[PDB]
Structures are given as C-alpha cells and as structure tokens.
C-alpha cells in the first residue's frame, strides 16, 4: 500500500522541523533505501535525499535524514521561502514481492513572508462578448499571501451564488499567489442590476471593488 | 593522492570478500599477478596493503612487476615477485572538471631508480645539465615535481585514471585476512582433506602430545615437512600423518 | 610521569632478576623478545617472542627511562632522587646453528663465523667433531681498488641533429646514419619528456652510460 | 545532460486504451532502470512499475495487474507503457523516472527516481472536444471559453508583448469545458502607444485566433 | 549502436574452452537470496552494448 | 591559441599595495615559466621575476626584493604579483610573459618571453578621481575633460558611425586630470544627412554621456 | 643592472643596419640565450630572435643575429616601413644569481616615406563649453611625416604661452602621425581678441590657420 506520513506540518522560520515516515519490518527495517523528494507547486518532484541522509549534488548541508526502528525522519532547520513545497517519502519493499511504495505526503507552509492585501480587478464583458448573447464578469485577485482567499459576489446589494466559479489560488512568479473568479449572467440579468460588486476575504482583509454597467 | 606520496593503508583481522570488487563493472583493469582472481575467496593472508593514487591513462601499463618508465623508476615501484592485484578505472568526471591539476603531481627527474615499495618526497632541485648550479632552479636545474594537466575531455589516454593496488603478504604470523568460507566440523582418525586457513593437505588427524609454546602454530618434522597444526578455533594441537599407501 | 600526545598518534596498546630484550624493526614489524631468568653469566637461554606491534615506524636512535619507588615527582630535575645498570648490544647478520631438544626448547647454539672450529661444526651440522681434516670454506683475496680506462675522445656526437631534423623519411626508404668515434651521452635522450616510448631491448636504459660500443646506427 | 521527453497530452473516452512513451537522452539508455509513476491532482504519489531496457522484464504493483503493459523500443531509446480499460478515475499525470543502475557496481549508489520527465496530462471523460472561443477585455485582458482540453498556450501580439502579462489558472465548468483568463498590466498609461492583441494557441484543438484589445 | 549487441557481466563460474552459455536466469550478486527474478542484489546477466 | 589576460587598469594612492593577475589560456599552464616585467612610459624595459606554476618557487631581481611577492591560483590558471608600498615612481605598465619549459626537453628550445599579454596600466598619484566632462564641437568633434583615469572608450552614435572617426592622444593637465579629442571627418558635405552624436564611455569612472553635434 | 646598447640608430632604405649589445663574461660570454624583440609604438613587444640568430615562425629570412666576445649583433638589411619600432636586447645571468637583464633600447627611424605637409584644423569652443564659463581652442594636426612637429599659438599677433598644451605626435593607422594641442582661455580673454591663430612647424614646413570669434 503506502507508508503513514503526517498530513500537515507547519514550521515557523528559524526552527527545526522533522517529518516522520513510519513503515513495516520488511520495508524500512531491512532495506536502507528510503528517499525524500521536494515537489514544488506546478513542478515535477526533484530528488533531495537519495538514501537515509546522504545528499546528491546541488543540495545544501542544511538538509539531513535519519533512520530508527520502522520509521525515518527528515530534518530541516532554518526554513527559507523556497521550502513552501510538498514533501514525499518512499522506500523499497522486498520479501518475494519486489516493488516500491510511497508515503501519504505532507504540506509544509513556511512563514516569515509578510502579508499583503489582495489586489482585486474587475473586468466587465466586452463588446464581442455582449454580441455573443452572454455576459461574463471576471474577478482577478493577485499580490497576496498566504494564498487562501474566498471570493464572493454581492450584486447590487444581495449576494448571488448563481454562475459563480472560484478556484484555489496558485503560486505566482514572485512567491505570491493569484486567483481567478468568473460570474456568468444573461444579458437581461446583466442589464437588470445597477452595478456588480466582487468581495474577497483574505485572513480578515476584505477588498471590495464596485463596477456598474453605466 | 598524487602519484608520488601514494597512500598506504593496512588491512588486517577481517573477513575479506573479493567478489564484490571483481564483479564491479567500473573497474576497467583488474590484473592479478601471482594469484588467480577467481581463487581469491579460498585463501588466507596475514596482511593486505592497499595503495591508492591517480595516474595518466597511457601510464597504467607501467603498474606491473617488471615494467619500466617514469612511474616505475621514479614514482611507484612494484617488486618482480609481486603477489597481488592492480585495480584501475577511468575517472574523468571527478579529477578533470576544470584544469584537472587538482594537486595531481609526479616526478620526472630523480638521481636513481626507486626500490620496491619505496617512497621519495623531496623539494630538492634536480640538475639536468652541465652546470652545477648547486642552488635552486635556474637553467639546467629543474623542480622534479611536475603537475598533471587534466584538461576536461582532452582525449582518451590522457584522462585521469584512479589506481588501487593490493599486495598480499604471505609466510608470516597466523593469517588475519581470510575469505568468506564457512568452517566445518573436525574429523579425526580418518583420512580426510583438511584446510587449515590456507594450509591444504590430505592425511589423518590425531591427538598429539607435542608441547607447542603459546606462540607457535605450525610444526616441522625432519626434511622440513609439516606434521603438526593448530586448530584456529579451539587452539587444539593436532598431529598430521600421511594416509596409508604402498606398492 | 610527564608525557603528552601532540594529537598525531596512530596506534595504542595497553596490556599486562635478569631481564633481556631484543628490539628488531623489519618490514614494518617491531618485534620484541623477552625472557625472565633469575640470577652477564656464562649460561644459555632463549628469548621467547613477546609482542608483534604490526604497525612499525622508522627508528634510528633510542633512549631509556628509569623510575623511583617513593620520591618526588618533579618533571625537571636531572640528578635529584635516590642514590640500576643495563647493557646494550647490537645485532648483526650472523649465521647460527640452533639445537632443539625433545620439548622444542632451544638448548644450545653455535655461531658459525666465530672460530675455525665453529665453522667446522656448522659445516658438519653437528656439535661434535671427530679427528681428521675437514674442508670448511674457501679463501679469496678481495680487491683493494677499482680502476677505469676509457679512450680519450671528448666530443659529443650529434644525437641532436638526428632527433630535431625538420623532415623525417617515409616508413620505407628509412634513414640510416652511422655514429662512431664520440663520447655518447644517453641521459639526455632518456630524460627528454617528449619521448612517449623508450623501449630498450638487450640493454638497461639506466646502464647505458657505462658501456662501450663499436658502431651505433 | 540527462533529459527525458514524454508523449503529448492524451485526450480519450472511457473504455478505451492509451499508450505513454518516454524518450530519454544524454545517458546510456540501457544502463539504468526506467520507472513509471502516477499522481492524482492534489493527491499523493503512486508507483506503477519499472522496465529493464536490456530484455523487457516487467514488474507491476499489486493494484495495477492486468491492465498495465511495459514495453520499449531501444533502437530509438523509448519506453512504452500501455494502459487498457481506461476509466474517469485515472485522469492524472504520469511520469517516467530513472532508477538505479541495471548493472552491479561499487562506485555507484542507489539513487532511486533521480531524474523525472515533464509528464503527460491524460484526461478522460464523456465531454467532447470543443473549439475554444476567445474574447478580449477592454481595460478600464483576454479570456478563452469552450475548450475541453486543459493545456492552452497564450501570448500577446504574436508572442512579442511579453511585458506585464500574467496568466491566471483555468477554472473548470460543469459542462466539461474550461475557462482561463490572461491579462496584460499596463496601468497609468494612455493605452494608445501600441495596439494590444491577445493571442490564443490551443494545440489539441489546433486553433490560433488573435483578438484586438481597445 | 545497441543493435541487439549484448554480453554477459555476471556468471556463476568461468567458461570452458569453446563453450556457449545462453540463459535468461537471474544472477544474485548480493547477500539476499531473492530466488525469484531481478530485484535488489538480483540482476539480469545480459547487458547490452 | 595562446592568449593571456591581465587585470583591469589599477588606480591607487601612494603608500598602498596593488595586486596584478595574469590568466592564461590555450596552453598547459604548468608547462612553462611565467615571467613578470615592467616598462616605464618612454623608457627601457625591466624585469621583475618569474614563478614556477608547479609549486610556487619565486625568484626576484636584485633591486626588487622586499616588496615583490609572487603567487598563483592554478585551479583557475592565474598568476598573481603583489606590490607593496607603492610610490609615484612606479606608475608604469606591467606585462605577464611566458618563459621556456618548466621541464627538461631536447625537442624544445629556449624561447624566452615568447608570448606577452595586453598589460595593466597602473596609475598612482595624489590626484583624486574626477567625473569626466564631455562637450561637442560644431564643425566649421568631441572632447573629454576632467577625468583622472587614462583609459577612455570613445565612439559615435552609440558605436554606429565608425567612418571618418579618428582618435587623438590625450594630453595630461597640471591638475592631474586628462583631456582627449575625438573628431569625425565629414568634409564637403551638408552636415545634415544624419544627426551626429559623440559618445564617451569611461569605465573606471563608470560614466556614459552622449553629446549632440550640430 | 642592464646591458649597454646604442641609444639612437638611423637607417636609410636599402642598406644593412647592425645593432650592438655589449654584456659581461657571465651574461653573454657563457650563456648563448640572448634574444631580440621589436616593440611597435603602442603595442606589446613581439618576439623576433629567441636565441643568437635562429628565428621563430612568422619572421622573415631578412633578420639575423650573431654573437662575438661579450657582445651580440642584430642584422637587418633592406629596411621597410614596418621597421619604425623600438628594438630591445635581453640575456640570462647566472653565476649563483639566476636572473635576467635587458638592454638600454634603441630607436630605429626608417626613411623612404615621403614627407607630407601637416594638416591643421581649428575647432572653436562650442555653445556648451561657452555656457560652462570656459573657452578651449583645439588645434588638431594630422597627415604628416615624420612625427616631429612644434605647435604654438600667436593669438592676434603676439605669441602666448599661457594655457598651451602640446604633446608628442603618435603613429596613426596610415603609418603617419597625429598631434593634438589645447589652448584654455577665460571667456573675457576669448572675447578680448579679434582672432586666434595656431602655427605648426614640421621640418621647416609651417602651416598657419586663423580663426576668429566673429
Ligand atoms: C599532526 O598534528 C598537528 C597538530 O597537532 C596537525 O598538523 C595535524 O593534526 C597532524 N599533521 C598531519 C596529519 O600531517
Ligand atoms: C629513516 O629516516 C632517515 C632520515 O634520513 C633515513 O636516512 C633512513 O633511511 C630511514 N629509514 C628507513 C627508510 O628504513
Ligand atoms: C620434556 O617433557 C618431558 C615430559 O614428561 C619431561 O619429563 C621433561 O622434563 C621435559 N624436558 C625438559 C628439559 O624439561
């Protein structure tokens, strides 16, 4: 199957963070071929520790690993902004059934990055879209951290949950996150409201942008 | 290490497996002199010396009991009665990344050839010419230590080659380096083929009254024949006599 | 006890009236032989091996340490203390004829190169010599000096122009140059770094400045 | 140096079969094991099997026996994986990974999954392929609509105006088609120095439409 | 260059003169007796050029 | 083939120390002696010393003992010369030169100083560095004023109008600054076909100013 | 120290010119490692004769060298326009003090090149220079041979030696020479004279250019 790994691990800057990986007797208790990989968001996993602790080229001396009993530990101290990536554990299974297994994964969220108020931009439907017998309002959110925001529409003064699409923000190039929202309305619905407002909540910071057909 | 000032490591009191080295695919050269590479897990030696250094690709053939040249004469000499193996493999990805010098030096000039297993480190200035400068450097006076220029990918035959040579000591105190063999039970009063950690023979083993001193393991009768042996697990003093024969 | 380590130590060993010792440093082994015989007398005693010490180092000179039962432990005094004599002998490559008894203990030994009678005993390989004439060894008058007589020529013949020629010949129609009546130095060619190959057949490259030839091609 | 190239993104319907190919370069293709792995979107990693380029020996995981076939054409140095009886639950990303050496060696270690590939995004569902619809957004952006395949290439002015352009993650609609937003950030300007044209390049649908922004 | 050009790295013992040895049997170059096919310390002898 | 690169031009004050580096390429750096020489402006040549790349052996001239140190980093193939207690009389040009072979050889000769380098122009005085002033010259040219360092790069129209441009030698002023003239020869013309701009690039002062010529 | 070498040598075209280099017993009388180098004006010295006469590649058969007693001779016959360069002599000194020494140098002036009247151009101060509360007159001289000219200013009718800068001409690309002169005057001084004249003498050829503020 797999190996039990803690699902969520949170680490503040400047401290040591240890990730566990518990296995069986024939998986980790006999074959010291465990490895650890860091998976950047949107990028393929990159090898970090090929065996217990020994490290490949291009890996800093900060990283370390250890084996004890039927479990293994990966040690990181003094976290950096680049450490906000998924971490995985793998091992080799023998005993007449040669195959390998993975772990349950772990999400590491490095702190220290200053919080920024989300930037909300509203784009009304264009002339081409209006000619297509449809109206779509695009609510773009960027330049914020952490990437945990909630996007809702309040119309004129009453919230509406029809035709609202919201997705989890993804990391940008500047180590921040961005989210995109869509509101689809019929031409009669679009012209039946004096304005439309998009509200975004970001850890208690609410940014409201109001746009009107006029 | 460099060709000169080669490393010398002593290995004793272990179970030595030589099948791991021979089965290694990287080893480009694995010449064995005085011993069969396949018949190495069945032997027993007193001391094993490992010498590690890095030389030039064309220069590997000089690492042999009876070869001559710059390396054999001035850097590393192997006795003509060598009993061991030489292991060499190409390492162009670790000793020629940039410049390739990496403190890899050798000795062009020396007053006379080396003795077997003799090292010679010296900053003294050699005088290859007529004028006796008797100082340092100058014309006709050179520094013997010349560095290897290992330009990245300078053609095969000039690339760095890492060489590890093993020398097997024999005819000494009871052997301490032995192959991975599982010892069997002791059988006495029967014509059996015994193998006492290197000493092989055929005969019948019986209890002996010989009083070996606590530092003697073997025993030689007249005409210099081995007639007594000491068991290497129970320190028992056994008597060896040939099995019955006649015309 | 005053000592130190200097942090370069590479070995360590801790274990547990006439005292005789032999210290021999051969092939990286420092062997020590000892014997505790109660009592320089005229008797004979054998020295059993004591320790092997399989590491060994280069040794050329040595010292000796003395102690006191109950006195001050000052590490600076030279003559202070109570108011122990030992003998030193040097080993030599001598031939011996050892006698093992029924128990394997060396009971007597004969030094071969000591007396004509000792040489006779060594040759016969026995400790008793009967009446008669025995031929032991040979006698040779050793040389007293070494002389060398070479012809006086004193001119370097041109190995340089053979090697630095601007244009060699093809494999066929190979050049053939005769060299004679010169003082030839072969150390210049062997010491040359350019030469990739310098195989010598029938002669030693180092033993080439000591010879004499009639013609060199 | 070492680099691995996968096949193009796979779009299929349930009940069919797919073939995934990994073409390697920069190393001796028959000197290292080739590993096949799978990863569900947002879930943990999983292992498929490995193939020994020398003869074709295959080993499969316990839960992937019967519908997994491992082959490879060494003449062109390609490793093939065959998946049969595709289901909607297998919509994921598949990676080809390099194992340890196929030969015993003492100067070599056991760095498993040392190198990975870009990966193939396989998408299987009952939604048919739809020609993308692209519309502009007059500043106070560019959006793509009605396109079943996920990967879409977007640029501005035929890939010339790459300044101030940020791409937003796509949001899936209930009808099976997707929707993405791409906006160029040109604030505090007259918006008249150059004509702004947004370009969409949807290779799976083989469409390239340019829209003017005014 | 592979062109089905293969050789044998691993074998139990040396060959006899003019003796051929073709085998898909898995060689065990290690401690663990896998006694199956491939795996760790168990390799396919036929390695391609 | 063989080529040697020196350090940048040295500007210093009396009583300080300077380091001169020669980086060689195209030949085995540890196969030939490296020689250091000096040459006063308008005077004869002089010899400093040589360095044996193999170990670091140094030999110095009789009149340059005490304030001359010879070192070299062979890993990057650089030869270093250290000059201490600098004086205004040592303002000169220094060359790195290649000697004969460090090894005895019969197929090699004794070509001393076979290859030389570009050289480093060391200037030491009490005059401080002054930002160059550049002015144009209307034809019936371009001049640079108030610049302590000697080497100045001059061009026309951002290094495009290289026709008819001649550079005149600089003249030293009593205040420690220099003065150079650079004129483009465009006679018997209307002087209106193209706009003439003279460019000055003073790297030691890190200045680049363009002046229009009308 | 050095070796005595003739300071000045003049050679007409078509004849043989010999340069001497006298040394000591332990310098030249024992070590036949003397060498000769040609130093072009503004260019680093280039090896010409590595030992007594033997020559490197790229050296014509015209050149030759010889050794006699405690001196050496360099022979050149049939001089060419490229021979107008400095020549140096060097040797190796032993006797328990291994070092090398150089010679006193020699300036060779090859004749045959036709004499050309110098071209004198006067550039008045520009508007930018006038706005800088300073006036500078630049007297440029080019296209003349030999490069031995004297530059003086005569103002209206009285020579002035205040603020006059003159430098030795340097070789141009066309094997000729060029010189630059500067005259610095205050704005009141510049406007107090009806004109300014620059006079250049070149082996009896005087070229006078008259410019006026009006
Ligand atoms: C010997 O010890 C000294 C310091 O006590 C130091 O040079 C080094 O540790 C040793 N020298 C070697 C290993 O050459
Ligand atoms: C020990 O070192 C000395 C130092 O000169 C040397 O002469 C002697 O030969 C060495 N002993 C050996 C190599 O056995
Ligand atoms: C040798 O051994 C026998 C055995 O009894 C003993 O009697 C005899 O004394 C021993 N020899 C010596 C010299 O002690």
Short mmCIF file of N, CA, C and O in Angstrom, two decimals, chain B residues 44 46 169-173 218 220:
data_model
loop_
_atom_site.label_atom_id
_atom_site.label_comp_id
_atom_site.label_asym_id
_atom_site.label_seq_id
_atom_site.Cartn_x
_atom_site.Cartn_y
_atom_site.Cartn_z
N UNK B 44 44.03 -17.29 2.49
CA UNK B 44 44.19 -16.60 3.76
C UNK B 44 45.53 -15.89 3.77
O UNK B 44 46.55 -16.50 3.46
N UNK B 46 48.15 -12.77 5.79
CA UNK B 46 48.48 -12.16 7.06
C UNK B 46 48.23 -10.66 7.07
O UNK B 46 47.66 -10.13 8.03
N UNK B 169 50.38 -10.24 1.69
CA UNK B 169 51.50 -10.77 2.45
C UNK B 169 51.28 -12.25 2.75
O UNK B 169 50.15 -12.70 2.97
N UNK B 170 52.38 -13.01 2.75
CA UNK B 170 52.32 -14.44 2.96
C UNK B 170 53.53 -14.88 3.78
O UNK B 170 54.52 -14.15 3.89
N UNK B 171 53.43 -16.08 4.35
CA UNK B 171 54.51 -16.69 5.12
C UNK B 171 54.92 -15.80 6.30
O UNK B 171 56.04 -15.29 6.37
N UNK B 172 53.99 -15.63 7.22
CA UNK B 172 54.18 -14.78 8.39
C UNK B 172 53.36 -15.37 9.54
O UNK B 172 53.01 -16.56 9.51
N UNK B 173 53.09 -14.55 10.55
CA UNK B 173 52.25 -14.91 11.69
C UNK B 173 50.90 -15.43 11.21
O UNK B 173 50.55 -15.25 10.04
N UNK B 218 52.57 -23.80 13.82
CA UNK B 218 52.88 -24.91 12.94
C UNK B 218 53.89 -25.84 13.62
O UNK B 218 54.23 -25.69 14.79
N UNK B 220 57.34 -28.53 12.14
CA UNK B 220 58.06 -29.16 11.05
C UNK B 220 58.88 -30.33 11.57
O UNK B 220 59.69 -30.17 12.49
#
